[PDB]
Amino acid sequence: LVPRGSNPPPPETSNPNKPKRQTNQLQYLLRVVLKTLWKHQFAWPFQQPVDAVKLNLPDYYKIIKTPMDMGTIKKRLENNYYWNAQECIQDFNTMFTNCYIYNKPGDDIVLMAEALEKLFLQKINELPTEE
Ligand SMILES: COc1cc2c(cc1-c1c(C)noc1C)ncc1nc(C)n([C@H](C)c3ccccc3)c12
């Protein structure tokens, strides 16, 4: 009748046990990298977790075991979840890679992801100096 499957909870975005810092690179990742991607025409499918129930994608979380999205990344930055800039960059990379696993090369959503990823890589090439 209907596929049987719930969404997982979204990724964790805060953790009181983790120490917190602000750094040049983390500030850039929020104010330049995330900001630039978030405002893009094609950001919207990537601004929140994939809702497999609403989108009728019952196999999505059968294969995507490390989901990630820009809404999560934004909250993690805002909550000082990341200590090292590379932890945030890795989350963006996971987001893109997940899209390229679940969706066929050349599909609409993949072309959208590629346009965002190009802009991401350009901004990462201009990452500022560390402390
Ligand atoms: C086809 O892939 C999607 C379509 C989405 C989506 C999320 C995905 C998505 C992403 C991102 N990574 O894997 C999947 C699946 N999130 C919300 C959303 N709302 C609509 C109307 N869509 C449709 C199905 C859509 C299809 C192709 C390109 C853009 C949106 C979507």
Side-chain angles (χ1 to χ4, degrees), residues 44-46 50 55 57 60 99 102-103 108-109 112:
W44 66 270
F46 304 89
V50 170
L55 299 171
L57 307 172
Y60 182 85
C99 184
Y102 182 87
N103 304 283
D108 39 36
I109 191 70
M112 291 170 80

Side-chain angles (χ1 to χ4, degrees), residues 7-123:
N7 292 320
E12 299 180 39
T13 52
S14 65
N15 191 326
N17 283 346
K18 296 219 283 176
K20 295 176 192 300
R21 66 179 178 177
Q22 296 179 49
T23 66
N24 300 328
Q25 294 184 351
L26 288 167
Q27 184 188 39
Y28 178 86
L29 282 159
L30 180 57
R31 300 306 180 194
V32 178
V33 181
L34 182 286
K35 190 169 166 162
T36 295
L37 266 66
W38 190 270
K39 294 283 94 102
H40 195 279
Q41 187 65 29
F42 302 157
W44 66 270
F46 304 89
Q47 284 174 340
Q48 59 286 310
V50 170
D51 185 338
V53 176
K54 193 116 114 342
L55 299 171
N56 189 25
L57 307 172
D59 285 325
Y60 182 85
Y61 292 108
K62 297 200 188 103
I63 73 164
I64 300 303
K65 302 306 186 180
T66 314
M68 190 47 58
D69 64 280
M70 298 200 294
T72 296
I73 293 168
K74 185 174 185 283
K75 290 176 181 168
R76 283 176 172 203
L77 287 159
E78 289 167 344
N79 297 333
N80 311 292
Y81 189 91
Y82 305 117
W83 185 260
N84 290 155
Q86 187 58 35
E87 296 175 274
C88 175
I89 293 164
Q90 178 176 310
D91 279 346
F92 277 105
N93 294 329
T94 293
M95 180 183 80
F96 294 123
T97 302
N98 292 340
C99 184
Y100 308 149
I101 288 163
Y102 182 87
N103 304 283
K104 188 175 184 183
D107 280 10
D108 39 36
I109 191 70
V110 172
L111 299 171
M112 291 170 80
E114 285 173 354
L116 299 169
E117 189 187 13
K118 177 165 182 178
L119 182 52
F120 171 71
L121 292 168
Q122 287 171 337
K123 300 302 189 183

